A paper describes a structure:
The effector RidL binds the Vps29 retromer subunit, blocks retrograde vesicle trafficking, and promotes intracellular bacterial replication. The 131-kDa Icm/Dot substrate RidL binds the retromer subunit Vps29 as well as PtdIns(3)P and impairs retrograde trafficking. Here, we show that the 29-kDa N-terminal domain of RidL (RidL2–281) adopts a “foot-like” fold comprising a protruding hydrophobic β-hairpin, which determines the interaction with the Vps29 retromer subunit and displaces the regulator TBC1D5 from the retromer. Thus, the hydrophobic β-hairpin of RidL is critical for binding of the L. pneumophila effector to the Vps29 retromer subunit and displacement of the regulator TBC1D5.
To test the possibility that deletion of the β-hairpin leads to global structural changes in RidL, we solved the structure of the N-terminal RidL fragment lacking the β-hairpin at 2.1 Å resolution. The N-terminal domain devoid of the β-hairpin crystallized in space group P212121 with two polypeptide chains (called molecule A and B) in the asymmetric unit. These molecules exhibited a root mean square deviation (RMSD) of 0.756 Å over 205 residues among each other, and mainly differ at the F-loop, which was partially undefined due to the high flexibility in molecule A. Superpositions of the Δβ-hairpin mutant with the wild-type RidL domain over the same 205 residues resulted in RMSD of 0.872 Å and 0.962 Å for molecules A and B, respectively. Thus, the N-terminal RidL fragment lacking the β-hairpin adopts an overall structure that is very similar to the parental fragment. Interestingly, the fragment lacking the β-hairpin no longer co-localized with the retromer and was found throughout the cell. As expected, the Δβ-hairpin mutant did not reveal any detectable binding to Vps29. The SEC analysis of RidL-ΔF-loop or RidL-Δβ-hairpin deletion proteins did not reveal any changes in the elution behavior compared to RidL, indicating that the mutants are correctly folded. In contrast, the addition of RidL10–258-Δβ-hairpin or buffer only did not result in the elution of the retromer. Thus, RidL10–258 displaces the retromer from TBC1D5 in a β-hairpin-dependent manner.
Numbering used by the authors: 8 to 78, 82 to 242
The structure:
Amino acid sequence: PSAKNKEFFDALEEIAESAKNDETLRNELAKVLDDILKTDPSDPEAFRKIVAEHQEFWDEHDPSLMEFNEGGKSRKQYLKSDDFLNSTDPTYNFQKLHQFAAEQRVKLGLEKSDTDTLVAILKNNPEECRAYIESKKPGLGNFSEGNVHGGSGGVLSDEAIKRIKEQARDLLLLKLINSSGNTQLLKDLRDAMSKPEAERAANALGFPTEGNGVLFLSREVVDALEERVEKL
């Protein structure tokens, strides 16, 4: 068959997308992400174990993640092998899954952040973002040095910081759309035919110019923009 590294990567993305509307699932997911985050990815035996420890969580979303029709190795041997989680995965090794868990843990905390937190994320450069995330403990996650070996900082790659900003962009845009009484300006952003046009309309609505590098109109923002513009 194949190792489950990418499937866990995709399951993490899918559960987080669903956690935006199930507060009880978000608190479940936060605990799982917190456990992965405090496990050293350089210890493959501990890393496989902490993932297998949450089978009850994985089975509620995808029972294929933890399945293994024994008949070959036993299930215990399988769960401790590269056949379950390949520590030498060229793309989704334990470091990459550890970094993705932290990036998801931040995005999870951003779903409850106020407007100022979202703006600071978009204004700060990658280096400031890490120190800023290392200053909001444990709102956006425990990125102290006790849990990360480390300190993070590290686990938040530059590409991870960019995806965190993309999430804060959508969260902030939805807030501005749900707040502004400037109907014509909301029409302008809805009808922007280019990024520079979207930039000028979004900046006027309150989106910081420092976040223009990640500015992009997603489906959920256009949908919310369409409703609000037609809302009388």
